[PDB]
Design a protein around this nucleic acid. Structure first.
Ligand SMILES: [Mg+2]
Ligand SMILES: [Mg+2]
Ligand SMILES: [Mg+2]
Ligand SMILES: [Mg+2]
Ligand SMILES: [Mg+2]
Ligand SMILES: [Mg+2]
Ligand SMILES: [Mg+2]
Ligand SMILES: [Mg+2]
Ligand SMILES: [Mg+2]
Ligand SMILES: [Mg+2]
Ligand SMILES: [Mg+2]
Ligand SMILES: [Mg+2]
Ligand SMILES: [Mg+2]
Ligand SMILES: [Mg+2]
Ligand SMILES: [Mg+2]
Ligand SMILES: [Mg+2]
Ligand SMILES: [Mg+2]
Ligand SMILES: [Mg+2]
Ligand SMILES: [Mg+2]
Ligand SMILES: [Mg+2]
Ligand SMILES: [Mg+2]
Ligand SMILES: [Mg+2]
Ligand SMILES: [Mg+2]
Ligand SMILES: [Mg+2]
Ligand SMILES: [Mg+2]
Ligand SMILES: [Mg+2]
Ligand SMILES: [Mg+2]
Ligand SMILES: [Mg+2]
Ligand SMILES: [Mg+2]
Ligand SMILES: [Mg+2]
Ligand SMILES: [Mg+2]
Ligand SMILES: [Mg+2]
Ligand SMILES: [Mg+2]
Ligand SMILES: [Mg+2]
Ligand SMILES: [Mg+2]
Ligand SMILES: [Mg+2]
Ligand SMILES: [Mg+2]
Ligand SMILES: [Mg+2]
Ligand SMILES: [Mg+2]
Ligand SMILES: [Mg+2]
Ligand SMILES: [Mg+2]
Ligand SMILES: [Mg+2]
Ligand SMILES: [Mg+2]
Ligand SMILES: [Mg+2]
Ligand SMILES: [Mg+2]
Ligand SMILES: [Mg+2]
Ligand SMILES: [Mg+2]
Ligand SMILES: [Mg+2]
Ligand SMILES: [Mg+2]
Ligand SMILES: [Mg+2]
Ligand SMILES: [Mg+2]
Ligand SMILES: [Mg+2]
Ligand SMILES: [Mg+2]
Ligand SMILES: [Mg+2]
Ligand SMILES: [Mg+2]
Ligand SMILES: [Mg+2]
Ligand SMILES: [Mg+2]
Ligand SMILES: [Mg+2]
Ligand SMILES: [Mg+2]
Ligand SMILES: [Mg+2]
Ligand SMILES: [Mg+2]
Ligand SMILES: [Mg+2]
Ligand SMILES: [Mg+2]
Ligand SMILES: [Mg+2]
Lengths: 148, 185, 53, 222, 156, 51
RNA sequence: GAAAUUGUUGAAAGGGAAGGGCAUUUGAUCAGACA
RNA sequence: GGAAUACUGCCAGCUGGGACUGAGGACUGCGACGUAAGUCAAGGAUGCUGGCAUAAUGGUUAUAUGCCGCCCGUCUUGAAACACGGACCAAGGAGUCUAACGUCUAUGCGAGUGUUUGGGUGUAAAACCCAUACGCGUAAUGAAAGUGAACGUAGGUUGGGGCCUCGCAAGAGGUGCACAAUCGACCGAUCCUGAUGUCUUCGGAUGGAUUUGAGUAAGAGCAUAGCUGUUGGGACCCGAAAG
RNA sequence: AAAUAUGUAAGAAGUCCUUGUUACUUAAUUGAACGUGGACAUUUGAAUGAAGAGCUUUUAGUGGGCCAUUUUUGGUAAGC
């Protein structure tokens, strides 16, 4: 709000805090990103290396969705089981009856392997798996079941 | 006149009450400046300062970071103080008992702690229980895990992350970011 | 300095303390009595101006 | 509840106890100061008797007054003027002479006047304008408890125990002397001698080593 | 309200004074002021009058008389710092004076007591003055600064 | 509250330094020093009065 | 029914501008406090 | 031969004249003097006496007198300037709003977070309620196909507040979050290596390298709000010659 | 070959003893680097000072300068 602003404080001072020598004029450096390769190159390299020019290939009509594939790490995983149900399955770690987790149903695309789940057996249904995530899963007597 | 050797009328540069405007926080401050003035106990002195601390210097302590500190040798029965909020961490599968004292406890964190039969104390209760801070373990969270500090110190060969909005290739990945486009950083 | 400070530090302790092994700056000199025996003061004056050239 | 007089007693008694120790120490110093003085006097005579020359030790303590104001001073002297705690005009401090302070004085001669202070003027400096530095704060002396409090650690539990440490350049002169705030002298009452200060004493001005003639000045400024 | 009201008020409790240390010790007078000495009044109703010093009263004042019958000045108080003390001097060992205190001069024309006191004391003095020729004239004549007198040079 | 000079306020002079009583009492500030009559060698005088 | 600016009345000052600062005399005017 | 004196210095020797100041408001301290009881000049003025009770003192104001005092605004190295604007007065008269943002801060909730496109409801543009989605965060790296974070108590070392233990204390030891330094490990890119196998060219285990990434290594974000700063907009306000 | 200026050092991140690790390195358990275990405290290693030290983020204005002593270039010289 106007009342808290430093212009209210500048009233009575000649230059509104913009200097008597260098003034406040329309657009000294040029407008916008003018001169980026000339009188504004020092600020552009440093702060923004990589700005000018090209790398990589063009993809006409790239529709994301095609590439939809959220990741879930083992790290969590067990979070996809409601808490009440969760403790029930932790204790009684077994074949015969082991929880089924549709990670596609949780809206994940791929399982990655961030770190240690307990030694409970899990049946893990997913579209994709990192070599390790699946390794770790088996190492507790789970399997991964490949879906779509 | 005087050849001053040092800048005059300098403010100390430390907070002195919280900038916060909450009564309760203001009251806890009342408790502890009293406690600090009259107990020669280091703990109360540290605690008082942390209260003044703004939100960024008060990063959250997680309930997993808690469990780990308790795994220090001879530390498992200490009550941990956190002058800040305490958050929950699904990633640990076995949380210990203990007693945590903190300003806020997120709903899930409070849950997890209480589930293992722990207890959640407020600092004022922590005071009555241990006015000299006996048997307390103070924990701080990570300040430089903020996203902001990624961009601090931006410059050539500092390798530190651009202030950038949209990202992906063709966003600041050409000239000056690779040997094949002018040069590299 | 150190190798030597280890020495007179042990060589003092193993005697009966009293060390003193920080360096000190030049101290002002002390009293003393200069004698005339064989040395009466010669009395010089300043010299006239002369040219030699 | 006792204490009324009860702990007033175990105190006032203990206070009389200290005034005692101070009295005997001051009686001591006095002896030492005159037998010291006389010794030299008779040295000078004895040597003349034997046809020789008694050259006294070079002075170990000098007293420095900042005699120049605050403007247009070159950086090197300036830093030194600060290290000697002479940061405003007419203020003064004690300096223990060694090569490594001798040079310091050398470097600041144009801006100061110094010389060798007598027992008389060291005494009247401390009695009238002696302030201690206590958690900074510059506290006036005026009771011996203040000194004992901060300087007792090193022996030294009276204003005269102070004066003794300075004049005799004690083994704790650093602590003893830094404890004193810089003295803050008024301008000389007589005047400066001289019509222009910023020449050397030896050329009719006021700055430089003026040896024992320092006492006449300071006493006019104290 | 026209104006708010403060949150705090002064106590109207009026403290006591600190226990000051200022003893009222007595006023030794300058040597020149012995009794029997002749004073010049520098100021006051009887300014410029020459007059005899009689007694130092309990309130630091000087007791003088003219004598009345000489120059018109009655028994009186004079303040010691409005007086020049000359070097001439009449013996006063026959003048009682014991009677005369501060109380004596409390305000509360002239009481007969005074008129009689005045006659008694003055007769003693006159007896004495008469011994030295010209004094009575002197005592009767007003002191005055003449051109070229330098008070800082004159002996009185 | 108010710094009192010793040097000219006997009360506190005596407060600091209790030797002050005896010093004044035994005059001390005017000690009559021992009269000894040693005389200087003529080597000293000649060279003092030389040229 | 302001101000610039004007008339009148009253008071004052003015030897090539006027106005201003510190200070006090003199004139005019006034508050407070006594009890 | 024996003195004196000057000169310089010292005294916690005595003592006169004069000026300015009198902060503080029970007591509390350090002392001094007394055989003592007491006294005191010892952590800041009291005692006694008088005059007016009013324009006396004081404020204001005008004038006089001593000394002093150029016209402001500006741009400038430098203005009182023989630099510019301003005869006078009133009333208008210039850093704003918006979109998206950086740092900082306050607040809510927290591995999440954001009710307000919409729906429900209403005392009707408000307040109250809410399903599905979405956005940003919770994963990085490659041009890309693509792969994708624990050797270890999520490591060693050094400093580290705080705590624990011993000690009357001084100290000694234990543990050590944040943060900092340094050596490692993990994930992707690059370059080597190329096991068991094979639709004989697929497959790429394993162990590596002065390479490299805006990464991992017991999450910190999301949202509202504020000041300052950033960009675009008439963009602090008035101004061309032109098109 | 000066004076004035100028680099570094004046300890606990130190000094000494014992004898682990390696794919580097030596004829060589030789060395090199990093260590484990042990010995010596504030006269622990010159002066003086220190209204403390260290660190982080973000932002204004500025980017016409002129003068004095000394050193000094061009110029006969200059308020150059
Ligand atoms: Mg705004
Ligand atoms: Mg407002
Ligand atoms: Mg305002
Ligand atoms: Mg201002
Ligand atoms: Mg301002
Ligand atoms: Mg203003
Ligand atoms: Mg300004
Ligand atoms: Mg500005
Ligand atoms: Mg301007
Ligand atoms: Mg410019
Ligand atoms: Mg581009
Ligand atoms: Mg994760
Ligand atoms: Mg992150
Ligand atoms: Mg010094
Ligand atoms: Mg004098
Ligand atoms: Mg004079
Ligand atoms: Mg004189
Ligand atoms: Mg002259
Ligand atoms: Mg003086
Ligand atoms: Mg008293
Ligand atoms: Mg007297
Ligand atoms: Mg007559
Ligand atoms: Mg009308
Ligand atoms: Mg006036
Ligand atoms: Mg008072
Ligand atoms: Mg007062
Ligand atoms: Mg009246
Ligand atoms: Mg009145
Ligand atoms: Mg009146
Ligand atoms: Mg008028
Ligand atoms: Mg006027
Ligand atoms: Mg003038
Ligand atoms: Mg201009
Ligand atoms: Mg110009
Ligand atoms: Mg001109
Ligand atoms: Mg112009
Ligand atoms: Mg004009
Ligand atoms: Mg207006
Ligand atoms: Mg309703
Ligand atoms: Mg409606
Ligand atoms: Mg409802
Ligand atoms: Mg729906
Ligand atoms: Mg991101
Ligand atoms: Mg990708
Ligand atoms: Mg492939
Ligand atoms: Mg290591
Ligand atoms: Mg330790
Ligand atoms: Mg350790
Ligand atoms: Mg790698
Ligand atoms: Mg690459
Ligand atoms: Mg990134
Ligand atoms: Mg703009
Ligand atoms: Mg236009
Ligand atoms: Mg046109
Ligand atoms: Mg055109
Ligand atoms: Mg150097
Ligand atoms: Mg040092
Ligand atoms: Mg120091
Ligand atoms: Mg300090
Ligand atoms: Mg800046
Ligand atoms: Mg800048
Ligand atoms: Mg430029
Ligand atoms: Mg700039
Ligand atoms: Mg100059």
């Amino acid at each position: 709000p106007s009342r808290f602003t430093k212009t209210r404080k500048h009233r009575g001072h000649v230059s509104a805090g913009k200097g008597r020598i260098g003034k406040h004029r329309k657009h000294p450096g040029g407008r916008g990103m003018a001169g980026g390769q000339h009188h504004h190159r020092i600020n552009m390299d440093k702060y923004h290396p990589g700005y000018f020019g090209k790398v990589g290939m063009r993809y006409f009509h790239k529709q994301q969705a095609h590439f939809w594939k959220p990741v879930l790490n083992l790290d969590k995983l067990w979070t996809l089981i409601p808490e009440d149900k969760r403790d029930q399955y932790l204790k009684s770690a077994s074949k015969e009856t082991a929880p089924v987790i549709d990670t596609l149903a949780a809206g994940y695309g791929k399982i990655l392997g961030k770190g240690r789940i307990p030694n409970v057996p899990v049946i893990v249904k997913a579209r994709f798996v990192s070599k390790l995530a699946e390794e770790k899963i088996r190492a507790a007597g789970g399997v991964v079941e490949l879906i779509a | 006149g005087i050849d001053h050797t040092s800048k005059q009328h300098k403010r100390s540069g430390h907070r002195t009450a919280p900038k916060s405007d909450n009564v309760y926080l203001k009251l806890l401050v009342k408790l502890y400046t009293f406690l600090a003035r009259r107990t020669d106990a280091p703990f109360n002195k540290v605690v008082l300062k942390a209260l003044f601390l703004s939100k960024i210097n008060r990063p959250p302590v997680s309930v997993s970071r808690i469990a780990r500190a308790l795994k220090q040798e001879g530390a498992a029965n200490k009550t941990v103080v956190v002058v800040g909020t305490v958050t929950d961490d699904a990633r640990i599968f076995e949380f210990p008992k203990t007693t945590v004292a903190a300003l806020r406890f997120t709903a899930g964190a409070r849950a997890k702690i209480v589930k293992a039969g722990g207890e959640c104390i407020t600092l004022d209760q922590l005071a009555v229980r241990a006015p000299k801070g006996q048997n307390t373990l103070i924990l701080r969270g990570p300040r430089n895990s903020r996203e902001a500090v990624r961009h601090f110190g931006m410059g050539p060969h500092k390798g530190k992350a651009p202030r950038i909005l949209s990202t992906g290739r063709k966003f600041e990945r050409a000239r000056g970011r690779r040997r094949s486009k002018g040069f590299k950083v | 300095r150190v190798k030597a400070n280890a020495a007179k530090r042990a060589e003092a302790k193993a005697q009966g303390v009293a060390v003193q092994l920080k360096r000190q700056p030049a101290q002002p000199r002390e009293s003393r009595i200069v004698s005339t025996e064989g040395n009466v003061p010669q009395t010089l004056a300043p010299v006239p101006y002369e040219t030699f050239i | 509840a006792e204490q009324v007089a009860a702990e007033r007693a175990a105190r006032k008694a203990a206070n009389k106890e200290k005034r005692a120790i101070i009295l005997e120490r001051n009686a001591a110093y006095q002896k030492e100061y005159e037998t010291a003085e006389r010794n030299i006097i008779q040295a000078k005579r004895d040597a003349k008797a034997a046809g020789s020359y008694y050259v006294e030790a070079q002075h170990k303590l000098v007293f420095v007054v900042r005699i120049k104001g605050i403007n247009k001073i070159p950086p090197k002297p300036r830093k030194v003027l600060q290290l000697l705690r002479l940061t405003r005009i007419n203020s003064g401090t004690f300096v223990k002479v060694t090569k490594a302070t001798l040079e310091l004085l050398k470097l600041i001669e144009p801006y100061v006047a110094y010389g060798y202070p007598s027992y008389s003027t060291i005494r009247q400096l401390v009695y009238k304008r002696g302030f201690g530095k206590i958690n900074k704060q510059r506290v006036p002396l005026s009771d011996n408890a203040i000194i004992e409090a901060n300087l007792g650690k090193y022996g030294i539990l009276s204003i005269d125990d102070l004066i003794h440490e300075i004049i005799t350049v004690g083994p704790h002169f650093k602590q003893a002397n830094n404890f004193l705030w810089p003295f803050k002298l008024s301008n000389p009452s007589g005047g400066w001698g001289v019509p222009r200060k910023f020449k050397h004493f030896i050329q009719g001005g006021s700055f430089g080593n003026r040896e024992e003639f320092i006492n006449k000045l300071v006493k006019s400024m104290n | 309200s026209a104006q708010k009201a403060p949150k705090w008020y002064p106590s109207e409790d009026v403290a006591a004074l600190k226990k000051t240390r200022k003893a009222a010790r007595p006023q030794k007078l300058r040597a020149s002021l012995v009794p029997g000495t002749v004073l010049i009044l520098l100021a006051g109703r009887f300014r410029g009058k020459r007059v005899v010093y009689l007694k130092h009263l309990e309130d630091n004042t000087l007791l003088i008389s003219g004598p009345f019958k000489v120059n018109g000045v009655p028994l009186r108080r004079v303040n010691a710092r409005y007086v020049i003390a000359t070097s001439t001097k009449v013996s006063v060992e026959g003048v009682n004076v014991e009677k005369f205190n501060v109380e004596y001069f409390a305000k509360e024309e002239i009481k007969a007591e005074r008129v009689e006191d005045q006659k008694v004391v003055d007769k003693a003095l006159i007896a004495e003055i008469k011994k030295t020729p010209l004094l009575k004239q002197y005592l009767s004549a007003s002191f005055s600064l003449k051109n070229g007198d330098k008070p800082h040079m004159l002996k009185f | 509250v108010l710094k009192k000079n010793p040097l000219k306020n006997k009360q506190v002079l005596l407060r600091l330094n209790p030797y002050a009583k005896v010093f004044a009492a035994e005059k001390l500030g005017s000690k009559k020093a021992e009269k000894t009559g040693t005389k200087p060698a003529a080597v000293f005088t000649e060279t003092l009065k030389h040229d």
